[PDB]
Design a protein around this nucleic acid. Structure first.
Lengths: 155, 386
RNA sequence: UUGGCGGAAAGGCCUUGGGUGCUUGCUGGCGAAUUGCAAUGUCAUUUUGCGUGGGGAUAAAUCAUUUGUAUACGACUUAGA
RNA sequence: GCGUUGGAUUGUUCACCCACUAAUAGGGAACGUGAGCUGGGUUUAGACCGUCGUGAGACAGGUUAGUUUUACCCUACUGAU
RNA sequence: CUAUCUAGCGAAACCACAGCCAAGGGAACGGGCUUGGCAGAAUCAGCGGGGAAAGAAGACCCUGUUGAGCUUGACUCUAGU
RNA sequence: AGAACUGGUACGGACAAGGGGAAUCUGACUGUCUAAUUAAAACAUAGCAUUGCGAUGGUCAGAAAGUGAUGUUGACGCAAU
RNA sequence: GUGAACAGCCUCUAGUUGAUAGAAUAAUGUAGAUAAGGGAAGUCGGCAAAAUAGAUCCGUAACUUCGGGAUAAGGAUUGGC
RNA sequence: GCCCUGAAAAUGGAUGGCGCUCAAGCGUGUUACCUAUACUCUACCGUCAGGGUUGAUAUGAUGCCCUGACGAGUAGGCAGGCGUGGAGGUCAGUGACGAAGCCUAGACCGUAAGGUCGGGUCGAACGGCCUCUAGUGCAGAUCUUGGUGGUAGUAGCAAAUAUUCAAAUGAGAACUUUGAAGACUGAAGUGGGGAAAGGUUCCACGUCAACAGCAGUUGGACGUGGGUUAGUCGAUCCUAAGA
RNA sequence: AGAACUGGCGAUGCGGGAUGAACCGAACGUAGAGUUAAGGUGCCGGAAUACACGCUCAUCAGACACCACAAAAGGUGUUAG
RNA sequence: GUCGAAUUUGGGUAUAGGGGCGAAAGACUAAUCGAACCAUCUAGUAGCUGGUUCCUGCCGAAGUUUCCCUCAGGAUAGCAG
RNA sequence: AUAUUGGCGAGAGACCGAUAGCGAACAAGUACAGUGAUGGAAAGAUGAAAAGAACUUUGAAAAGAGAGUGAAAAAGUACGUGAAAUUGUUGAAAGGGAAGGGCAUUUGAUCAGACAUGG
């Protein structure tokens, strides 16, 4: 408990977390935003296709030097990619949430992702050896991911 | 600081920037001065460049070591089926330039052209000029009005024509559409000619004739990203140079403190627009003619098509223009053949040619025979046959 | 509503014929206050979301796949019911 | 506006000859231009000589050998979305 | 084989603040100031003009009542003989 | 070692594997050194020459010594240039 | 096995198949090749490259410390049966 | 006198720019107009000066009140104050019904150093006034120690010829195991043993958080165990330079 | 580069000289109203495209102290003497 | 380049810092050499370089004299509180 | 009678308060480095009490979501408070080669000062 800022009816909502996960903070940020406010199954379906290389994740912030793809066109963008490890972890969290929702008997068909937020876990430090007898840091930038699914309210 | 020796700059700054052309169909940017005293006629034509071959002819040029003597010249052949007229566009003069006021189109358009208006034909509903057509319903007015508007205002008049690309070996089904200025006389006469030709066909032999000098307009063959050396013809640096030697060593003096628009740099080479002038017509082919490729000296029955077929193109089954020398663009590419913006009197330009012989051996290797008939005569019987 | 004219960016102009309101050309009958000695007191035109009733019309582009006249990647050019 | 060169000797700039040519003008751009090159000369440390000095050493004298680092950032410039 | 594009992995240098010019004056060569030219999101590959780019409180020079290695009939001594 | 025959005249068929000549400067040669900018014409060298010494000695060591190197030596030797 | 061979090249026994991977094939590179005609005109300088090369038989200058120089130079030959 | 010739330099460019020709140019005259932290008059802050006033009569005599003049500032001198750790004294000070601390384009006082309040968070101690005392106030010192960025998902992860099909196992297989194929080291070995050195890395079972700069079910890794058998092989004995 | 007297800059903002340590004006608590300085008043820009007599036409006019240079010498240009 | 000897090399042993060792380069003596490494004397000295921490109020400089192995420093007088 | 930065036993401080105080408040002369002489750190704080999260559900697992314990989980053996740099998400706003600042006012947001006169 204690997620970031949410403004959603907790009674119509369910949520999931993952902490100290060894995936790229920057890549997974980019992909969390890719499905933000999405209806869960659209999200689910799309992420499955990004694995299949049929659509992609737009890279909007952590993105300089990244190649260009025709697949960014959809999202008005030139620079997108296919972050498998990120997609994969986000899927696990979506899956969990979805489980938690069923347990609360929320309507699977009304569910959209109402909150999704990656921030930065503590780094994991390894060493690289460099020319002239030096050492440099070779680190991991792990992620904390949290998200929330909620029932869309009706007319 | 005063460059030690002097040399001319590499490359022409009048052909910048050296980028990819906007369209693959290079634009006609000038049509000939109009002489409104003579029959309404097209001022250019559209074709597909098919390949090159070789000619022999006597030269006619008093005072040349080669007068009254055979010379042998490269030619290029461009596949030139008839062009169909499907619209007229009228232009007015303004203090801001020529401007189009309307376009009036033909009642019926073929799929070939209609296809040019779509990116996904297979799955479109092909609604292209379907409401426009109905403008013909009414005994005329809507159409007849706009024709009248072009007569009243309108200062220059172009027809819209397209290629019949299906009459051509090309895989491409989408035809090429273009405006061509009508130079024959009188604005009113122009639009009538145009009206009368809607949906009708126009052949090259009504535009161009033997001995004529004509211009070619075409996008040049692409080559992708080039280095400085081949892109600009900059000089190789010595073998000894560190970090590579296809460069220019000095990109600039210290001031102006900015690399300047005139130094040579790597980037795109090819796929540029070129208007190439002064290409003499050496043949106007008839497609119905089974002796296309023959001469009053070489009496044999043969078509212009090489043994084996034009490499990377196929056969020539239509009217065609044969032009001396060479032309920008590559095989398969659309070319606009434009008439001269001027009255050349060159002597070279006035000469009337007559071919004596047209090469027809295979261009797919060192071909030794002009016709299947000649080959069999030479080789005698094989193990296939009979 | 009858004719016409206007392409320089015409998108406006002139015209014919009635209908309808007003008419301070002129002569009457009423009304106005207390908004209190000025202060906030005439409504203009832009977009944009919705509301009703009528007329109307009934596509494509992109990804993926494909060509190689194109190409570092994007991009270009082809093909696919 | 447009050109203004090919060589022999010298690290040379300069100089000087040969030779071609329409002509072989003169200069600037941090004495343009070394994360562009080269490293022949200068100008570290090895070394021979001549002059100088008791000597260590010295020489605007001769001679030989002597490691040429980094761009992935901004801008400019070339091209590309 | 690289570069390039993709998945995984993922450093460093450097950083007053920053980053389009012309002229002016100015610590006598401006990204900033003054007057003008101008000026349109977000970007990719290349590039070596500029950032008087970056790497060791300048190798040369001078100053200091700062040294050390070395030499000698400088000054003052000393093992030895 | 010889001879005949044979082939698109090829045949040390891949692999393997000295370019040569005429000279000038310089060091005789083989050898040696600046590990990480100098391999050289610098150092060595054999050869030549000079110097000291007969042991109570020459040359050198040690603070001193019943102390030490040459010396398991003796001038065809040891020591110093 | 080839061959003069503990060379190079291919093999048996034994041992490996481990040193991120996928898709492309721009510039510029790094490493490997080739170029018509000319032949050092390039350059401080033939730097780099190229050319020679095994064996058999012929032949082989000046000079010399008489040992050399010398694979001097220059030529013919080379498979298979 | 004005004007013209005399009058040649390097990025494109400067009467400041536009542009101006009975001027918006040059000489001269006459009015009006614009505008400085200056001048004039007034309010307020402070500084300095002069003067009045506890004579009995509530609350500051280093006070209250009246009057005139004055205000630039580096190095630097002096003054009056703001704030911190601790100390004597005092408010019989605040506090678990919430001390201290922290957060807050909320509020109020002060020219300022600062002080005060609300709200949030928090959890055990703390403050005002008169004094005393100093290890007492940071932006810098290529300052010290720590922590963090842009750079950047960038440079890169290209030497050592080379991999492929299938099955098995597994949550998961480009990378494990088995099979097949293709290849390499080529006995001057990528074969089989040792010396120095390491010290358990050897073998088995289990097993993947970290480590093996992709991965991992694999390992020289992690956990738990097992394992080195001498009259004849060494040391041990001998002597060497020498100690 | 070096002296004399004074005034400045340095230590100093403000208004003018586009810009600018030092020129012109004027020195500075917080403000209100008025007036000016030096300098300006076509437009940029607050302020007469004011008034008056002349002079000047430049195929290189000219335009304001310090100040961002110009001379000898010439003109049948035009002015007045 | 050399490649059967002034050859290459293991281990053992000896030489220690104004000392060693040097076919001699001021070379080498544990990434250290024109005097190694370690600790202490030591917070070595510095006329030189850098930095030196709250506010406001008042006053407010000097770059000159004389003397100094004085000339990037002091003392002295002046200016200032 | 005098000395006493050592040893043993004690009483103290206007001393320091975990970057301070001895190098060491801790398995500190430790871990680690170096052939060697020597060099030599970092590192304290859940809660009164482990009551250290039974059980259910998703997952290969780590974990998540519930539940539960507790005065509190805004204390979960990453643990008291939990600043800054720097970061994610949400909300508002601006943005033609930097951004930030001054005087002034428009517009939007936000906050005030009132306080009393017969019914």
């Amino acid at each position: 408990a204690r997620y970031g800022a949410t403004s959603t009816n907790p009674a119509k909502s369910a949520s999931a977390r993952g902490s100290y996960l060894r995936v790229s903070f920057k890549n997974t940020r980019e992909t969390a935003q890719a499905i933000n406010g999405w209806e869960l199954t659209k999200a689910q379906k799309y992420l499955e296709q990004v694995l299949d290389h049929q659509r992609a994740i737009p890279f909007r912030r952590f993105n300089s030097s990244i190649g260009r793809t025709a697949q960014g066109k959809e999202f008005g963008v030139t620079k997108a990619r296919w972050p498998a490890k990120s997609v994969k972890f986000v899927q696990g969290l979506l899956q969990n949430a979805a489980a938690n929702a069923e347990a609360k008997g929320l309507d699977a068909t009304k569910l959209y992702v109402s909150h999704i937020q990656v921030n930065q876990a503590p780094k994991q430090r390894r060493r690289t050896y460099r020319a002239h007898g030096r050492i440099n840091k070779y680190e991991s930038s792990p992620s904390h991911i949290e998200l929330v699914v909620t029932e869309k309210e009706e007319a | 600081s005063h460059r030690k020796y002097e040399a001319p700059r590499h490359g022409h700054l009048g052909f910048l920037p050296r980028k990819r052309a906007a369209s693959i169909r290079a634009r006609v940017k000038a049509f000939p001065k109009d002489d409104r005293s003579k029959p309404v006629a097209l001022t250019s034509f559209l074709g597909y460049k098919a390949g090159m071959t070789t000619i022999v002819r006597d030269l006619d040029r008093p005072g040349s070591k080669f007068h009254k003597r055979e010379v042998v010249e490269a030619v290029t052949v461009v596949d030139t089926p008839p062009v169909v007229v499907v619209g007229v566009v009228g232009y007015v003069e303004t203090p801001r330039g020529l401007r189009s006021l309307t376009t009036v189109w033909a009642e019926h358009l073929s799929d070939e052209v209609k296809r040019r208006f779509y990116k996904n034909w297979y799955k479109s509903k092909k609604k292209a000029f379907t409401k426009y057509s109905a403008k013909y319903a009414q005994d005329g007015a809507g159409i007849e009005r706009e024709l009248a508007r072009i007569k009243k205002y309108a200062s220059v008049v172009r027809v819209l024509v397209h290629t019949q690309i299906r009459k051509t070996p090309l895989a491409q089904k989408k035809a090429h559409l273009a405006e061509i200025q009508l130079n024959g006389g009188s604005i009113s006469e122009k639009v009538d000619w145009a009206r009368e030709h809607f949906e009708k066909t126009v052949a090259v032999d009504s535009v161009f004739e033997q001995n004529e000098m004509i211009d070619a307009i075409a996008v040049t063959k692409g080559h992708g990203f080039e280095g400085v050396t081949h892109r600009w013809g900059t000089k190789k640096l010595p073998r000894k140079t560190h970090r590579g030697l296809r460069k220019v060593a000095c990109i600039g003096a210290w001031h102006p403190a900015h690399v300047m628009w005139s130094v040579a740099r790597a980037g795109q080479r090819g796929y540029h627009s070129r208007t190439s002038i002064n290409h003499k017509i050496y043949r106007v082919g008839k497609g119905d003619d089974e002796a296309n490729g023959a001469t009053s000296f070489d009496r044999t029955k043969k078509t212009i098509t090489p043994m084996g077929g034009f490499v990377h193109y196929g056969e020539i089954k239509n009217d065609f223009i044969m032009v001396k020398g060479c032309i920008p663009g590559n095989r398969k590419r659309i070319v606009t053949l434009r008439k001269s913006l001027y009255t050349n009197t060159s002597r070279k330009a006035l000469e009337e040619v007559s071919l004596k012989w047209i090469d027809t051996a295979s261009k797919f290797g060192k071909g030794r025979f002009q016709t299947p008939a000649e080959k069999h005569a030479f080789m005698g019987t094989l193990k296939k046959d009979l």
